[PDB]
Design a protein around this ligand. Sequence first.
Ligand SMILES: Nc1ncnc2c1ncn2[C@@H]1O[C@H](COP(=O)(O)OP(=O)(O)OP(O)(O)=S)[C@@H](O)[C@H]1O
Ligand SMILES: Nc1ncnc2c1ncn2[C@@H]1O[C@H](COP(=O)(O)OP(=O)(O)OP(O)(O)=S)[C@@H](O)[C@H]1O
Ligand SMILES: Nc1ncnc2c1ncn2[C@@H]1O[C@H](COP(=O)(O)OP(=O)(O)OP(O)(O)=S)[C@@H](O)[C@H]1O
Ligand SMILES: Nc1ncnc2c1ncn2[C@@H]1O[C@H](COP(=O)(O)OP(=O)(O)OP(O)(O)=S)[C@@H](O)[C@H]1O
Ligand SMILES: Nc1ncnc2c1ncn2[C@@H]1O[C@H](COP(=O)(O)OP(=O)(O)O)[C@@H](O)[C@H]1O
Ligand SMILES: [Mg+2]
Ligand SMILES: [Mg+2]
Ligand SMILES: [Mg+2]
Lengths: 318, 468, 332, 339, 325
Amino acid sequence: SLQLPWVEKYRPQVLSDIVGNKETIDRLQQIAKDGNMPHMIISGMPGIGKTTSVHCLAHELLGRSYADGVLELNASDDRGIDVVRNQIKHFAQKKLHLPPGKHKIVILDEADSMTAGAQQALRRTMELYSNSTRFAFACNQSNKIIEPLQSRCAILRYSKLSDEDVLKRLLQIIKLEDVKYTNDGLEAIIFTAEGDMRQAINNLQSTVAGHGLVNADNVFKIVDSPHPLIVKKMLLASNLEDSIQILRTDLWKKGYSSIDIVTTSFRVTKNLAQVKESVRLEMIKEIGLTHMRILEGVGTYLQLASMLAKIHKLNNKA
Amino acid sequence: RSVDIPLPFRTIPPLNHNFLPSDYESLKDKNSASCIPVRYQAPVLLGTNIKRNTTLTWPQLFKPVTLKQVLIEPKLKLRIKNWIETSFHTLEKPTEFVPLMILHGNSIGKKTLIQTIMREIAGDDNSYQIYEVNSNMNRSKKDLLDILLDFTTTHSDYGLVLFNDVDVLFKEHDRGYWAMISKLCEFSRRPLVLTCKDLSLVPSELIALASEQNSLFHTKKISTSTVYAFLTKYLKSLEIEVCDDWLRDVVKQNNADIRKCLMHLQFWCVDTEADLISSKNRLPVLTSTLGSSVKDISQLTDLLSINDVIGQATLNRSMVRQEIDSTTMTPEKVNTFQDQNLDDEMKLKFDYVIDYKLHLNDPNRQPLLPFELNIYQHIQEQLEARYSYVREANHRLDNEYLVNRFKKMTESTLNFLASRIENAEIDLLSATTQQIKAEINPFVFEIAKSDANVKFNADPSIVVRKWE
Amino acid sequence: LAQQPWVEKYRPKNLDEVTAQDHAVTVLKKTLKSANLPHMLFYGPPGTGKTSTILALTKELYGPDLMKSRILELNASDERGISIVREKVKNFARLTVSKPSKHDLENYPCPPYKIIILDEADSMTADAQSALRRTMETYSGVTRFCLICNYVTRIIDPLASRCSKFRFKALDASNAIDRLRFISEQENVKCDDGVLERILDISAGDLRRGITLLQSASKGAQYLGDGKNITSTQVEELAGVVPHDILIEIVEKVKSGDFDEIKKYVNTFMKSGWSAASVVNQLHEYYITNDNFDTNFKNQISWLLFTTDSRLNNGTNEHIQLLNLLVKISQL
Amino acid sequence: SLWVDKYRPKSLNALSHNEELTNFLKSLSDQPRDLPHLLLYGPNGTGKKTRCMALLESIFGPGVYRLKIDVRQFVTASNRKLELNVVSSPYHLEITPSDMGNNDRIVIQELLKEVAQMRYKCVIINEANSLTKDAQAALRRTMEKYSKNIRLIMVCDSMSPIIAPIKSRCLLIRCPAPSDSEISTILSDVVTNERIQLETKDILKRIAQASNGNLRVSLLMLESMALNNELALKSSSPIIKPDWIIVIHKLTRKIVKERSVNSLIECRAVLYDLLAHCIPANIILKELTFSLLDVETLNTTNKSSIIEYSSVFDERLSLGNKAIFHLEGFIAKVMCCLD
Amino acid sequence: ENLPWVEKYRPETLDEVYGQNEVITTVRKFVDEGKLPHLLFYGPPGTGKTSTIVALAREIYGKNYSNMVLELNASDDRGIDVVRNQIKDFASTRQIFSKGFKLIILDEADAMTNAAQNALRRVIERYTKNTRFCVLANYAHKLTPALLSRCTRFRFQPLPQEAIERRIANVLVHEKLKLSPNAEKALIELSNGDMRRVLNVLQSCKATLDNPDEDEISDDVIYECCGAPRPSDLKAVLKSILEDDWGTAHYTLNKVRSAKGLALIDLIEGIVKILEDYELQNEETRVHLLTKLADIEYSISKGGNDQIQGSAVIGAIKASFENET
Ligand SMILES: Nc1ncnc2c1ncn2[C@@H]1O[C@H](COP(=O)(O)OP(=O)(O)OP(O)(O)=S)[C@@H](O)[C@H]1O
Ligand SMILES: Nc1ncnc2c1ncn2[C@@H]1O[C@H](COP(=O)(O)OP(=O)(O)OP(O)(O)=S)[C@@H](O)[C@H]1O
Ligand SMILES: Nc1ncnc2c1ncn2[C@@H]1O[C@H](COP(=O)(O)OP(=O)(O)OP(O)(O)=S)[C@@H](O)[C@H]1O
Ligand SMILES: Nc1ncnc2c1ncn2[C@@H]1O[C@H](COP(=O)(O)OP(=O)(O)OP(O)(O)=S)[C@@H](O)[C@H]1O
Ligand SMILES: Nc1ncnc2c1ncn2[C@@H]1O[C@H](COP(=O)(O)OP(=O)(O)O)[C@@H](O)[C@H]1O
Ligand SMILES: [Mg+2]
Ligand SMILES: [Mg+2]
Ligand SMILES: [Mg+2]
């Protein structure tokens, strides 16, 4: 058998359970209760509650009619030319009786992967049959969908979840799962989440099944990313020779690529509150220079070594 | 071997990483004031109206009931009204009158205008039957010429055929589409309308007949002030009170689109006790002070210049491979359709939208995905949050600007030098653009300036204003 | 018509006829007679005899008529590794190998496997990590990858594994003059003393540049129609090398140290049309090799020449860079 | 059209200055069969493209000058309407690399495909230096493949950024700038055909010395002064310079006379007006640098710093996107040094 | 039979995998309990990503490996259908009597496209109950977060010295080969935790050994076969730059590169590695040396002339080390 992942076991079934973007969710709750659901294009970063919001809104709107009132299409299904002109038009033209205010919902999940030609053929399908059916869009990039489609929909841009929102939902999960935890353990999970509740649950679930008590040491053993404090010590070492030793033994010899080292270094530098806001921009600039060198193709150990030397030169010259 | 570098060997000390939980508290994300919500006032609503409790969307709830309510300029409203009226009276007379109107332009109500006019032509809802041909169906000669001919040949009644989105055509699904229009131009006694956003997709033949018959109308976009005024009247009908700052904001981001704003208003004008969308960013403790020392600015200007070099490089180098669209026309797809061995079953598998511009995509230099690391934006956002003129420089001179300026600028030069007492058109374009930008055109202004100074050549005022 | 580039007009026809490279021929003679030549790599300076040697082996294996068909030299320039080479190789090798021709019998061994020549196969828009490797597993009985590289900086150990590379040493002075002198004698090229050494010095050991430079110089001598020998100045002109007289003036203005005097000379120099990159290369030769300067002067001027060369390579105004370099050298 | 375009040598015999190259180009027209790929380089306004056009005319005929304009529109991955004026002729075709931005590699590989697909067609590449190293390698691909039907003529003011493989397979031709005497001789013929009354021959010499070897500038300067003075040039007639040069000259004085923060804000506004007038940034930086060095109140140490910072920012300008940041950065460092 | 040593010494069981101890026990924990999540193995190549999953699949399925494991490569011919159709046919079709989780192994999925990765994630989500997906990719940053959040991540670290030494002992005492301790160390440092490098180099050394029963492989054979620069050659260049004349330093720089086919990029990387083991007296010496050499290495990739780049390396090292003196 298997154990249900906490990503799916604690999936919100009601729109109220979703945390983050409190303004957008509150209006969505009013729409579900009242009716007349407008065309929306929910956009934002992955794992912030875009697909969940659409599914919760559809369930709270149709209810018992959700089985035959929703035509959900994702990237796995075919969303080509023939599907738009035949399958979607047939669903829109289908005569389904619903309580007043309720409307059929055509959920086109991951619309950024849809071709431009399919989107163009979908223009008049949503406009002509909006009396009986409605369209809901969820995507990671809002610019992938063509402009004329965006002119017929109320674009909702979901934002990154705040640290309070992610922590609040994690508290409910551990309370309902009887999970031993500490303050430093949860801070590491929020650090690795980066406003991604899906990644916060996965890190929390793996910590429990991996090493029991959720400590920061236990958390950072399973993310298999460069340790922020190891990178911070390398970026803030008083001696350049010590920092070079840290990079070689703990980052380069452990197989961490130059992209992950730079990404972790920029992440740690962004939160270095000890240093001044002027020097912080300079150290970010050197990381930006190093990241550019890797993208052209020069991503050897010397480029990372020079980045440490330039950063340590900034600290000593200050 | 026997090579010993004259430097002492190093005895690296063991490096130990014993991190206290106190150090893990430093991993807390520091407060970033760059992000700045504004939290506009919640929408104060009053009364209970039927216009608010409706089963129809707001853009179609405010469907125009007459010609006056449409936001197209009344100059072109009268011309289109005349032609349709004269068309129905002409096509009732046995017959030079080609029933084809092209209503191009970036306007909004290009389809509702036809419907609202047709309502006034007959006066009864059942009298007018407009057959609308959209891109949601297969607009091929084999699939539509049979139905359309019977609709436009037999024989108060007022029938019109509308061809919406005529610029969106597919290579195989809409085969023989333009031939069908030419067939409809001859054997039909009912008016035909084809709306579009770009006239280049329409063949040059059909442009000629419309221009000769004065049935080629260009509906340009309308000012945002008129759209802002119309929204105020609409929101008054449902008894909605809205702060004028947010209503001005909505029109700006939606590019003065009546349909986009009404969709935008519908979501955000519900009765909830929550603040509105931030949209416009308030000043995040914006202090663009002089800085006193030029040395401090000499560091910021260098930082801005370096960051632009980083932004130029990183922005178009993505690690994750992105695919090309199967519907945009590409050089590989153009030659794929040129083979006669390609059968029907696979031509449909990869069908492209007909376009006049080849889509050239680089499989190695592609735009960065949102989840990829981007250090250019973080530096730009931080710098824009503390120095105002950086944000002004973000949208000062884009690529679209200084190119249409140069095109208009050369046209004045090509008109001034052609007015002396075809050769100038090609010989200037033969000269390199850099020489035109810095040598020829700056000197043509000198010649033109001296012409009007004494008040030889002619027409010197046009060049002067272009080189203000 | 009758014209053909001299770079290929004097390519070796037999394996032993190649100039020098005794290491290459000795292993190749052993490998050719066994008829089982595996996929192999050659590395050396660009134009040191890589494509010539592999074709000389190829000519001795199959028939010249059959060589152009059996050995389809898929270029990294013409075809892409995973797009066109990938599509062509699977079509070419699945295509049944044409029967050996008659003149092959008892004169040309014709080992049935097809040699797929890819000179500088790493120079493309995509790296075939295993697509080129996979077709060796499936088509080991026919497909062979006689690839060519430049240095020891390999792209991948897998695929490039069972390879016995040959260290293509750059042609020495003695043999390269002899090959250069032989070509001039066949074409009755009139040249005075010092020209043959000058062509190699500009080409820096490279023969592909060297033979083409002589052909351009030979045409230039015929273009004048005066019936005179090719001069070293003519060889210098077609290669973009700044003359020594101009360079001597450059190193003397910086010795004076006057900023205005250097500024005036550069303004006149940029009107002459001579490239600044050739000056930096020639200033590097004059200053580093000279024994009139200390280590401190040469250490600092090495960075100044490197910084100017890097900036002059990314499309920068030559007048600004050359003036900046000359002024900075003056302060040294 | 203009005197620069209507007094244009349209044949190899019509060339006046630099006779040695004219004989070299005439000898190339003797055997068009073995015409090699050409890389003509030299200063601006030296007649490089004029000699290329004359060389092509001697190979095919007067029909090479029969130019037709075909506008080609392309779409990249982010929907920017890239339009390029591809100058063509029944014998040759002309392209301009510095019109497609960094997307030149795809359009160059695309545009050469149909020309090869459709005894040879000559392709003239203006400012071949501006080509990125990706496209220069892609150019090397075409030379080793389509040499039978495509002959490549490359014209660029600077040969240094060109890659070595292109140089090793292209006949390097240098076009030195004509001397002041040669420019005056060209202007003397130009004046006679327009019946311009010259008080003395020194007027033409002063025009030649003010052009720094640029024939187009000297031709444009002569036309502007003659038309301003009813085709009657005197010794006291001021030399007409473009307004942007005067604006830059005013800009240099402001930097030296006022070293403050508000002055830089005014300088940025001046830079915006110059950039809004479609003036290339590198030309603005080059003129600003040399005019600043011409100020007599600056000592040697200041002048060495001006050329050092200009060289640094010129590299940044070529590797950047928005020129306002780099141009302002150069000025800010200059004011930081002159204090 | 004629077979490469790479295909001969592959780990058939999970106990034969060395150097990945943390991954092995956790993987061995999943089988014994019976809970097996979707697997995502990534890291440097040759670390045993395919070996680990194949050994686990053979350990669980026994003789049913052929009929219950479907292996896919995204790099070969695989359209949007061929990526999914073979996966969807294997997932939909079931053996009825075999209710165990069907395993699909996806090799080199970092080359898969953005939309294909998103389509794969939905395919994985559809068949969670009856199908298990294993995804192999070389780089994690090339994978979308949508696919990353579905499969558990296991980073395969490079093999340590001890892991390579143990497998080296197995090869020598089984294939009748003798390795000197100096040659063994030189292979280990050059391997960089890649057993595919180790097995292929040893195979070529045996082939070039005309008397494999009595000849002992030394340092020169390993370096020449793999084309790597010898430390003595790198040390000779470094000492010539530090303590000799500029003319002699230039002579040694060009001679070594020409006689060994050594690029300047490899020279700079080797010099930095060697100079890392020396206690430089001044801190600013290391700062200037690392900064100047990085700019030289970046400019080399842009295609500069060799002579100026080579002299810049000599000047940077000479000028940095005079500061400490
Ligand atoms: N704000 C939230 N409140 C509660 N649970 C959340 C929230 N955001 C994410 N989750 C959980 O994390 C997972 C996110 O699932 P989805 O909403 O489908 O992800 P997504 O936002 O659509 O991003 P994609 O699918 O990669 S485009 C689910 O298991 C949710 O239970
Ligand atoms: N006063 C108004 N006049 C015109 N249209 C209005 C008005 N008020 C609301 N609308 C809506 O604005 C939209 C404009 O008409 P559409 O048919 O959607 O656009 P179009 O004519 O097809 O041209 P497009 O949008 O550029 S493809 C319709 O949805 C109308 O319901
Ligand atoms: N060792 C050599 N023996 C004889 N001729 C040689 C030799 N090396 C170079 N040449 C001459 O120079 C030409 C170039 O030689 P190759 O190196 O085989 O060509 P190549 O390998 O294509 O050059 P590259 O590396 O692609 S720039 C040959 O055609 C000969 O004319
Ligand atoms: N930890 C290990 N223990 C034993 N043998 C190993 C180990 N890692 C790699 N090898 C051997 O090295 C070779 C690598 O085989 P693979 O399983 O394909 O490795 P891999 O990490 O999957 O590399 P790729 O990039 O996926 S092909 C095989 O011959 C293995 O026997
Ligand atoms: N030999 C010459 N005799 C007379 N005028 C010339 C000569 N060479 C060039 N010119 C002038 O130069 C102008 C063209 O310059 P052009 O070739 O575009 O400069 P560039 O070489 O920088 O591209 C022509 O108008 C022509 O009058
Ligand atoms: Mg989603
Ligand atoms: Mg070759
Ligand atoms: Mg594998």
